[PDB]
Amino acid sequence: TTIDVLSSLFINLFENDLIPQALKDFNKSDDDQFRKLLYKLDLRLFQTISDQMTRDLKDILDINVSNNELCYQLKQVLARKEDL
Amino acid sequence: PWEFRKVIQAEYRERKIMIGSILRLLETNTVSALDSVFEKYEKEMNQMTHGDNNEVKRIYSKKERLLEIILTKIKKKLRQAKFPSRISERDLDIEYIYSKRQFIQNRYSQELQN
Amino acid sequence: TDTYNSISNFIENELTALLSSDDYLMDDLAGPNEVCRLLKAQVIEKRKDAMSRGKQD
């Protein structure tokens, strides 16, 4: 109820304002070779931030399922070995 | 986007350290990212910083200062937002649960050969 | 002997992590910015549900 909302609120937070802020700013500064730094250095920042969090928020969204399945998987194999 | 509560109040009707706990989870995520991919992109610094360490410091200060002004903005936007305390900063950390997965998958392995 | 640790290392990092990192690095080296930084926004949308940990377990 609150895990998914926090996951959706934060991914939309960067994607709607912060990621475009780095994207829109970089669209102008390309003549000055040093001004290419700040905004694409900023672009690589939030763009990867959304990259690993979606690999981290989904990680806790799968590890609470995969391990739950694995804990389930641990049950019948324990129900096998005890039965053995 | 911004204005959490207007969305959040419209959300939580169809279903502060805790708020700070969520807040410091952003800090861990936004600072490790501020570092981890910085060296992955650091090999491009020399060719476009014109061999100037001051320009390297200039971007670091600007890439930082542009974050706390939002970090203060996100702090003031998160306090006004409300959440139920069903989240732990330990659980959201990948390493704590990845190690727990390692223990669980290993425990699944010793009994497998048993 | 616990062969599961060795096999898990082979299919977790030796296989999947290598291909992911190589894809990102080599396609980045293929460049300019826009073409590679967009063509991979649609690979997540169509290779999804293929890197979930449970089903590769």
Name the token pair of C12.
């977790």
Chain C interface includes B113 (CB < 8 A): yes
At position C19, the amino acid (one-letter code) is L
In 10 A of CB B34, how many CB atoms? 16
- Asked whether C16 and C47 are in contact (CB, 8 A), the reply is no
Among residues B22, B42, B36, B34, the alpha carbon closest in space to that of B62 is found at B34
The experimental resolution of this structure, in angstroms, equals 3.7
Helix, strand, coil tally for chain C in percent (to 5): 70, 0, 30
What is the helix (H) or strand (E) element at residue B20, kind and residue range? helix B17-40
Query: Quick count: other Cβ atoms within 10 Å of Cβ C43?
Result: 11
**Calpha distance A40→C53 (Å, rounded):** 32
Contact A49, A10 (CB under 8 A): no
Task: Report whether A2 contacts B84 (CB < 8 A).
Answer: yes
Task: Find, among A7, A11, A15, A13, the residue nearest to A57 by Cα.
Answer: A7
B68: tokens are 């706390």
Provide the b/e sequence for B64-101 (b: ≥16 CB within 10 Å). Answer: eebbeebbeebbeebeebebeeebeeeebbbeebeeeb
Alpha carbon distance A12, B7 (integer Å) = 12
B21 contacts B87 by C-beta, under 8 angstroms: yes
What's the CA gap between B48 and A34, in Å, rounded?
6
Nearest alpha carbon to residue A1 among C48, B17, B85: B85
Closest Cβ opposite residue A62 in set C33, C37, C54: C54
Torsion (CA) B47, C17, A48, B1 in degrees, nearest 10: 170
Q: Looking at the complex, does the CB of residue A69 fall below 8 Å from at least one CB of chain C?
A: yes
Give the minimum alpha-carbon distance from C1 to chain B in angstroms, rounded to a whole number: 8
Nearest to B5 by CA among B78, B114, B59, B81: B81
Buried b (16+ CB within 10 A) or exposed e, A6-32: bbebbbebbeeebbebbbebbeeeeee
Q: Phi/psi zone of residue A31: left (φ > 0), alpha (ψ -120 to 50 degrees), beta? A: alpha
Question: Which experimental technique did the depositors report for determining this structure?
Answer: cryo-EM
Q: Is A42 exposed, middle or buried (0-12, 13-18, 19+ CB in 10 A)?
A: buried
Q: Can you tell me whether residue C57 is helix, strand or coil?
A: coil
Residues in chain B: 114
For residue C52, give the nearest of A40, A62, A70 by CB distance: A62
Q: At what angle do helices A36-83 and A3-13 cross, to 10 degrees?
A: 160
